[PDB]
């Protein structure tokens, strides 16, 4: 891999919208980062806690995946779990900012229960 890899795989792990939107780019570009051999797959939500409300939550979902993956295949995953998880978190009150009133509330405390879902391991 280059030599930028963990400084490239922090940069798309942060909780800022800026690395959001950066992994956002690249996710809809993965081959022109092929040279860096990340772990891509992704299992969205379907892992996560139920959503009654049906918000769209499936890209949080992808960006820690993400983080998880390429964390542990670096061998690192122990110091990084918790950004990644509050990275989580605020990628899915981002969305959650596209509503008012009681589904704002509603899409929050979903937001928290997929939050501390991930948190209970560690």
């Not at 963990?6 to 690249?26: D, H």
């Not at 051999?37 to 949080?60: K, V």
Request: proline fraction near 4%; hydrophobic fraction near 35%; aromatic fraction near 16%.
């Amino acid at each position: 891999a280059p030599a930028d890899k963990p400084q490239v795989l922090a940069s798309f792990t942060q909780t800022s919208a800026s690395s959001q939107n950066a992994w956002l780019a690249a996710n809809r570009n993965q081959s022109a980062w092929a040279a860096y051999e990340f772990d891509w797959s992704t299992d969205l939500c379907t892992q996560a806690p139920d959503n009654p409300f049906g918000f769209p939550f499936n890209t949080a979902c992808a960006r820690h995946d993400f983080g998880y993956r390429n964390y542990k295949a670096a061998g690192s995953f122990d110091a990084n779990k918790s950004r990644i998880d509050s990275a989580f978190y605020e990628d899915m009150k981002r969305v959650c900012t596209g509503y008012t009133g009681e589904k704002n509330t509603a899409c929050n405390s979903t937001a928290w229960t997929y939050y501390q879902a991930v948190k209970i391991f560690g």
